[PDB]
Design an enzyme around this catalytic site. Structure first.
Site, mmCIF file in Angstrom:
data_model
loop_
_atom_site.group_PDB
_atom_site.id
_atom_site.type_symbol
_atom_site.label_atom_id
_atom_site.label_comp_id
_atom_site.label_asym_id
_atom_site.label_seq_id
_atom_site.Cartn_x
_atom_site.Cartn_y
_atom_site.Cartn_z
ATOM 1 N N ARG A 175 -3.417 9.760 -2.833
ATOM 2 C CA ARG A 175 -2.222 9.460 -2.062
ATOM 3 C C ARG A 175 -1.877 7.994 -2.240
ATOM 4 O O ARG A 175 -2.708 7.114 -2.021
ATOM 5 C CB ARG A 175 -2.399 9.769 -0.565
ATOM 6 C CG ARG A 175 -1.130 9.445 0.234
ATOM 7 C CD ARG A 175 -1.013 10.206 1.552
ATOM 8 N NE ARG A 175 -1.566 9.474 2.681
ATOM 9 C CZ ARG A 175 -0.851 8.751 3.540
ATOM 10 N NH1 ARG A 175 0.465 8.654 3.412
ATOM 11 N NH2 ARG A 175 -1.459 8.124 4.538
ATOM 12 N N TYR A 202 -7.894 7.813 13.430
ATOM 13 C CA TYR A 202 -8.937 6.798 13.365
ATOM 14 C C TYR A 202 -9.789 6.757 14.615
ATOM 15 O O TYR A 202 -11.012 6.615 14.547
ATOM 16 C CB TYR A 202 -8.336 5.406 13.194
ATOM 17 C CG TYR A 202 -7.837 5.116 11.812
ATOM 18 C CD1 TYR A 202 -8.716 5.095 10.731
ATOM 19 C CD2 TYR A 202 -6.489 4.855 11.580
ATOM 20 C CE1 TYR A 202 -8.268 4.819 9.451
ATOM 21 C CE2 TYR A 202 -6.027 4.579 10.304
ATOM 22 C CZ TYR A 202 -6.922 4.561 9.242
ATOM 23 O OH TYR A 202 -6.478 4.275 7.971
ATOM 24 N N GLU A 255 3.505 7.466 9.296
ATOM 25 C CA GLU A 255 3.398 6.948 10.655
ATOM 26 C C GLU A 255 4.686 6.431 11.305
ATOM 27 O O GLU A 255 4.887 5.224 11.457
ATOM 28 C CB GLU A 255 2.327 5.857 10.689
ATOM 29 C CG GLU A 255 1.012 6.307 10.064
ATOM 30 C CD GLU A 255 -0.112 5.313 10.270
ATOM 31 O OE1 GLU A 255 0.150 4.093 10.223
ATOM 32 O OE2 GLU A 255 -1.261 5.756 10.465
ATOM 33 N N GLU A 307 -5.030 10.417 6.415
ATOM 34 C CA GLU A 307 -5.672 9.121 6.701
ATOM 35 C C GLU A 307 -6.822 9.223 7.687
ATOM 36 O O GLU A 307 -6.711 9.819 8.763
ATOM 37 C CB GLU A 307 -4.649 8.080 7.217
ATOM 38 C CG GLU A 307 -5.079 6.625 7.006
ATOM 39 C CD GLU A 307 -4.260 5.653 7.842
ATOM 40 O OE1 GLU A 307 -3.584 4.782 7.246
ATOM 41 O OE2 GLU A 307 -4.306 5.757 9.088
ATOM 42 N N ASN A 342 -2.821 11.311 10.463
ATOM 43 C CA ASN A 342 -3.606 10.093 10.286
ATOM 44 C C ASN A 342 -4.376 9.859 11.578
ATOM 45 O O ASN A 342 -3.779 9.707 12.644
ATOM 46 C CB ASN A 342 -2.706 8.893 9.984
ATOM 47 C CG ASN A 342 -1.960 9.036 8.666
ATOM 48 O OD1 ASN A 342 -2.399 9.744 7.758
ATOM 49 N ND2 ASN A 342 -0.838 8.342 8.550
ATOM 50 N N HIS A 371 6.321 3.782 3.008
ATOM 51 C CA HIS A 371 5.144 3.237 3.648
ATOM 52 C C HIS A 371 5.401 1.808 4.110
ATOM 53 O O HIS A 371 4.707 0.869 3.715
ATOM 54 C CB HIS A 371 3.918 3.303 2.737
ATOM 55 C CG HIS A 371 2.622 3.416 3.486
ATOM 56 N ND1 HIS A 371 2.227 2.498 4.439
ATOM 57 C CD2 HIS A 371 1.626 4.334 3.415
ATOM 58 C CE1 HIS A 371 1.045 2.846 4.921
ATOM 59 N NE2 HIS A 371 0.658 3.955 4.316
HETATM 60 C C1 LIG Z 1 -3.136 4.027 8.337
HETATM 61 O O1 LIG Z 1 -3.943 3.085 9.037
HETATM 62 C C2 LIG Z 1 -4.516 2.058 8.196
HETATM 63 C C3 LIG Z 1 -5.439 1.226 9.065
HETATM 64 O O2 LIG Z 1 -4.709 0.464 10.013
HETATM 65 C C4 LIG Z 1 -3.406 1.238 7.527
HETATM 66 O O3 LIG Z 1 -3.979 0.329 6.600
HETATM 67 C C5 LIG Z 1 -2.440 2.180 6.798
HETATM 68 O O4 LIG Z 1 -1.356 1.442 6.249
HETATM 69 C C6 LIG Z 1 -1.924 3.252 7.773
HETATM 70 F F1 LIG Z 1 -0.983 4.108 7.123
#
Ligand SMILES: *[C@H]1O[C@H](CO)[C@@H](O)[C@H](O)[C@H]1F
Ligand SMILES: O=[N+]([O-])c1ccc(O[C@@H]2O[C@H](CO)[C@@H](O)[C@H](O)[C@H]2F)c([N+](=O)[O-])c1
Ligand SMILES: O=[N+]([O-])c1ccc(O[C@@H]2O[C@H](CO)[C@@H](O)[C@H](O)[C@H]2F)c([N+](=O)[O-])c1
Ligand SMILES: O=[N+]([O-])c1ccc(O[C@@H]2O[C@H](CO)[C@@H](O)[C@H](O)[C@H]2F)c([N+](=O)[O-])c1
Ligand SMILES: O=[N+]([O-])c1ccc(O[C@@H]2O[C@H](CO)[C@@H](O)[C@H](O)[C@H]2F)c([N+](=O)[O-])c1
Ligand SMILES: *[C@H]1O[C@H](CO)[C@@H](O)[C@H](O)[C@H]1F
Ligand SMILES: *[C@H]1O[C@H](CO)[C@@H](O)[C@H](O)[C@H]1F
Ligand SMILES: *[C@H]1O[C@H](CO)[C@@H](O)[C@H](O)[C@H]1F
Lengths: 447, 447, 447, 447
Positions: free
Chosen positions: B76, B295, B165, B351, B293, B120
């Site tokens: 990606r 985290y 995002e 992500e 995405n 992006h």
């Molecule tokens: C997904 O999160 C990461 C970590 O903050 C960023 O680097 C990417 O640009 C984002 F799409």
């Protein structure tokens, strides 16, 4: 974030007789099933045993001075049954009673409330020779032991616990054979479990009849499992895992019956609870509170080959303590709410801590992982209190590193390091962290 | 425990144009709002910027050879809008298109499926000068950019994502002012959010009309919050936190409307969505899948002073990555199930990764914490799949350490270490761990 | 002490196809039972497999240059059956044959005598699908494989071994299920053992009929056990342990019958050797020498519950290598004398080495423990020669660290370190020590 | 593996007077041949001597408290002949006797059985001036010394040993000249050997006549050699090496004659045993047990130039202790069985240990190699007992690091480290390991 605790929240520490006392043959002490188990090749790692241990039979004055400077308000300890009744024979051993009088008086002298656990696994071997817990006669013997303690320490002890972790005493010890007496028989485990309950109810009744001062309860170790899948079978596997630890002992006490599922589950394996007329009424004796022992949480799924409960624990990849248990504090918050099924009862976290084997380096024990563990769990405690749940206190499992049963001295849980070569005590960094928390009565998490 | 993945599960890695490419003024590339933002004192740590970065504009052959030996099936990456349309002016820059042709051909030559992210965050500055995203004219410009890409790379790219995002592009960038263009105005953020959606719908429509090969979707960063208390207010605070990240963009796309609560919530603050006739029908254009995405996860409570959502995140004391985010993988499993409200749609974890700043020592990067993080999250992915959810693939956030937006190069997320003094690539231990996992197609957690 | 070896003692090193080659799908190579076994979750540590390995399929020129500077006179390697006959189908794969032609020509060009092991556990999966070794048809297939090699490499290879370690191929693989195909059936193991023997005899007969140049033999891994007590039962337990490894294969070859005890022992367990008319005559085909593989020695006692041989190995407390095997070199001297029961036959130590996991530090691999191990065993070799025994050569197990079967790449046995992340070769200190020993042709032990 | 020892197995530790006592001129102590030898330039490494040593003449209370906490049941120590008879003159020194009374009473007070070695190499110099041991008059003097001890400590000492290692006293000291008096004359060594035996027999006779309580024996250091080859000459060389250490002293005691071969061997070198009428009858006096001292084993071959026994020890490459001796515990098991030629006599391992020079680091002495050594040898002891051999006890050579004769203090053998700059005692890790073994009465070997 700042977590402020209730004005009268009770902070403390905990230990168990066989794990710290030592002097296993001193002053007429009789042998317990654990002395026997530990003295048997292949039962305990490295052949470690409770002879000597932390030698707290002789060094209690130092231990108390150390918990005193900690700012703690209570100390949970257990009574060695065989020090009081060497054979559970009825023939009292005054020297044994005198030891606890010295410990208790020193505690009260220091403004530390004794939190007495009557039974912490050290059944006199003499009683085991006749069937121990499997024999109803043992019920009568415990009640005599309990009564003796109520009469001897009336007014000096205001907090009492009959049994510590019935699940371990019954199933871990008689079904899985991991702890003394190390048996592997479902029926015997169920018998032990039922007899502990009757013994518990009778002791509570005597406590009431005698007019003994204080409150009395029981302290089960609580389990918590979440399903790997949304399947009904995984859900059932988790229900069994959770219920056998708490519900199998608490439903009888609070509602007058064993969890029907499980009863059916065990019947399928040919086992039945040896219930006699009057037993359930006895077990239903009202109690003032309960102690909850929590260490970990798990994710389980149904698996026909995973033990007698057919409940498999999945290794989710979470980091673990040095004894191998994953840390996931949410479990404490989840089970505290789960337990409300018995009403908003008074609950004390009698046990919580982590096995972190850091040693003394440059004069200190940098056990940051223990601090991290305690911080996470104290947050869930505050969280429960904030939800209106009556969690009255917290006792860090173990003031001192000690004999960790089948693991021997290899697995350290203390906030105070003990070098077993010299018996020297060295407060760990977690000890100073804890001293600050209890002293301030509030906690702060920081990045 | 062994976790075996589906035969056609798609393993990959991800990057973004401005974070790795470099050559910010090369071959006619125009400036983006991020070049401007980064070149502004006080916006990015240490004054770091995307000039040079990982110099992937020149070193893509090496990067591809490295992802090739990883055994990955897709890559990606995003397209720098200003490399294609320097001013979003309509005047195409063939040199820009040629770069992506070289990257894509090399990918297809190596049996690696391109997974193209059109937007992006690098909006051409020329467009921002007129209102960027706040100006509906920008909608038309994106569609032209998108169409150009569909026509130029037809048959070479089978996986497309319109926006990466939306929550960050709109709210983080225009309300909280943390990312370019760094504005702090609720109405403007809502305008940007709505215009991204219209631009997304029109692009999808053109994709369909042109008969472009492949599938197309959108990739929102998903949030997950759990209430600190059982109070209705804490519950509401979590609903807002969760919904603004996903529902505010997905409900319009899948159900034809913005989440009513929130609409009301924003109305209270005097903000309204600039919806024009036909907009919602456009946004409702059918899509083939979505990228998720993820985290982290949080525990929140209502707090009138905690931002425009009045949702305070509690520091529960959990360990965090080097960028400060707590690791709690269950959040991924929870939100995947939450998202089923839109049906069992095709979902790709576009992500997932962790900021672990370990450097090269003795020739290697012992990033065990990254391995631990990935293992935990891949388990939740397997867990979701096992529940019958259509999670089709997983892309480790970042093949390479790169420009981490406002954090600059200080926060490393790569599986491959990049020394920015030399541009030398050094595969981290997580890289070899990942190579084994993707190669075997299954995972094993061990004590 | 100085240990001077015979003028024509043959020094060498050894490897096996699946453990070093890699390129498991290259040039038409078919799959072997080990590719299948390794690709199965739970069979090999960490899910390691023979894909890639030491990539010796491509890096053989470097390996040969390295063994050349070692001063070695022979190189023992094995032939991947599935590279020659992808399906053991009879349809030859010239590309496969060409690989070995390149290796062999380069060896002969460097004055290094090829020592060819025909079967080193990589039975084509196609044959296993029909019963592999359990099916007599496999016997015919091996003979064709063997014959093809004799015809193709006539004059280029003067040393041949039909099978490497029959005990592992049969019992470890089909009774204990530790190695591919991982079965646990006594009868099947015995069938495999018997069929290997017939296949061996027929191959030797063809070798003779074809007039192929050189000598041919078989290489069993030899075991050695000494009784814990002087009891007749302990003595019997050791006899079984020793005989099943060597005698069960060597008595048939040299004397025309299976060891009667053991035959009776297996009959008690309901297993019988599937001997057909003519089989024993075939197996009795004369051979030129045998290869002996030795690593360790043990002290055993009779124990009814210790496996199918009821022979328990006692942990005497001796230090062990990193794979867990005790070092006691006297075992090599003891078994060499034991083997004289078949006459003073030509014996080559085809396998001997130790698992020592030392890594590269400061540019070198200080594997002193490997040097110590080799020194001790070479002394026993000199000792045997001095007793008049015809030990003709010695081959250090593994020129390179490699795929150690079920242990994966975790257990290193090489004299040359291989970093599997880069395939870089780094000669260990044992390599330079060995170069000096072979070059001088004598050894010296010093305090 | 678990190795459980007999209920009444006797665990202990051992030392020798001159090696630990010190106070070499205190309380009228006379000089011994070792004071003289050590005070001679070039005889002992670094000019070290027994002045001071471990100062156990003054620090015995601490040493005993340390062996007490070890859980040991006996303590083997020797009596300084010159402390009792400064000139072996017949004029008793009460102060000397009083020292041993203090040591013995403290031992008995602590429940530790004294195991008294009468002669541990410290012959009074006055006696050496007249020929020491070479002069039959010395025989009478020893008997008086012995008798004095039997009369003075009757009932306080139940275990007695006349001589410690006759081979060292005679051959090492008078033929090889390595130990005091440092002579190199075959005839003189043989004379010394014979006179020790007569002195031993007479002492035993007096012991019997006096009715002294307890048992009495002798403690030879036993040797064990195995032939490098199967040749008759190598076999003969090993027989000489083994027999001169044990048989040359034990055959006379148990069977009434010196080993004929050896007698012939020495005759060839012009030496003859000075046997007088009645001598052999005296030497044949019945004894209750023997002490066996074992440290190592060797592989030998005949070599005309290898010393007076023409027996060359081959360096097999086995790892050695810090004093240079190879560890091969099987030797203990082999010689115990060899010794059965005298019947199944009561045998105590009076000496066994290893020179490991690890120092105090971080407050401890991590002497893992000593633990490893002891574990290996205790296994052979259990093994012998299991074979029905009467091995009654085991004494770890040296409670303390001490004066290691010609090596001085450089070679440490203690389980307790002694810093000779301060005399501070620091129990080594082997001490705690040993405390656990003796306390449990069983041993476990683990990977
Ligand atoms: C997904 O999160 C990461 C970590 O903050 C960023 O680097 C990417 O640009 C984002 F799409
Ligand atoms: O002192 N007593 O005579 C006496 C007797 C039975 C007592 O208790 C009885 O003991 C039986 C076993 O012996 C159990 O089966 C009964 O459930 C229990 F009530 C008690 N008590 O628990 O207080 C006291
Ligand atoms: O090429 N064109 O003439 C053209 C014009 C308007 C187009 O799109 C229109 O753009 C307006 C802003 O300028 C937005 O307000 C409308 O929502 C959008 F449909 C498009 N298109 O999106 O494909 C193309
Ligand atoms: O080429 N051929 O026709 C042929 C046939 C059977 C051959 O061999 C035969 O094979 C049978 C299984 O199919 C086994 O049962 C026999 O023991 C074996 F002699 C051979 N050979 O080993 O050389 C060759
Ligand atoms: O007291 N005494 O008169 C006396 C004399 C000789 C004695 O012993 C004698 O001594 C001689 C050397 O002087 C040796 O040659 C004799 O073998 C020994 F019997 C003993 N004793 O050993 O008990 C005692
Ligand atoms: C609570 O658990 C700890 C840890 O296993 C034990 O040491 C205690 O005895 C138990 F009550
Ligand atoms: C000889 O043993 C070694 C060590 O287990 C193996 O790697 C070889 O394949 C075997 F032939
Ligand atoms: C046993 O051997 C040790 C080691 O050489 C000596 O120190 C003792 O004195 C001896 F009796």
């Amino acid at each position: 974030t700042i977590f402020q605790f209730p004005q009268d929240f009770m902070w403390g520490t905990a230990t168990a007789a066989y794990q710290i006392e030592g002097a296993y043959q001193e002053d007429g002490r009789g042998l317990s099933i654990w002395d026997t188990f530990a003295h048997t090749p292949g039962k305990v790692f490295n052949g470690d045993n409770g002879n000597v241990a932390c030698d707290s039979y002789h060094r209690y004055e130092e231990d108390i001075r150390l918990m005193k400077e900690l700012g703690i308000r209570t100390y949970r300890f257990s009574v060695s049954w065989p020090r009081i009744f060497p054979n559970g024979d009825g023939e009292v051993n005054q020297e044994g009673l005198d030891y606890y009088h010295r410990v208790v008086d020193l505690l009260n002298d220091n403004g530390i409330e004794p939190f007495c656990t009557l039974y912490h696994w050290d059944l006199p071997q003499a009683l085991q020779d006749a069937g121990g817990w499997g024999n109803r006669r043992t019920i009568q013997a415990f009640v005599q032991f309990a009564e003796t303690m109520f009469r001897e320490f009336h007014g000096k002890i205001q907090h009492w616990l009959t049994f510590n972790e019935p699940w371990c005493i019954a199933f871990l010890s008689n079904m899985l054979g991991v702890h003394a007496p190390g048996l592997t028989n479902l029926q015997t485990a169920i018998d032990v479990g039922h007899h502990l309950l009757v013994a518990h109810g009778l002791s509570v009744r005597r406590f009431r009849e005698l007019g003994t001062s204080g409150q009395i309860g029981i302290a089960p170790n609580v389990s918590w499992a979440v399903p790997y899948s949304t399947s009904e079978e995984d859900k059932a596997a988790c229900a069994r895992t959770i219920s056998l630890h708490s519900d199998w002992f608490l439903q009888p006490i609070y509602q007058g019956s064993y969890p029907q599922f499980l009863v059916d589950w065990f019947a399928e394996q040919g086992a039945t609870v040896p219930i006699q007329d009057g037993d359930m009424d006895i077990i239903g004796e009202p109690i003032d509170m309960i102690g909850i022992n929590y260490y970990s949480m798990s994710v389980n799924r149904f698996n026909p080959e995973a033990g007698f409960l057919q409940s498999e624990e999945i290794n989710m990849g979470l980091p673990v303590t040095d004894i191998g248990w994953p840390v996931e504090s949410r479990g404490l918050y989840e089970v505290l709410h789960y337990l409300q099924k018995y009403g908003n009862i008074d609950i004390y976290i009698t046990e919580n801590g982590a096995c972190i084997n850091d040693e003394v380096v440059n004069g200190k024990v940098q056990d940051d992982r223990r601090i991290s563990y305690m911080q996470q769990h104290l947050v869930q405690v505050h969280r429960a209190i904030h939800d209106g749940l009556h969690v009255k206190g917290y006792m860090a499992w173990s003031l001192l590193d000690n004999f960790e049963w089948a693991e021997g001295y290899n697995m350290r849980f203390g906030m105070i390091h003990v070098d077993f070569r010299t018996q020297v005590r060295t407060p760990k960094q977690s000890y100073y962290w804890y001293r600050n928390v209890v002293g301030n009565n509030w906690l702060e998490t920081r990045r």
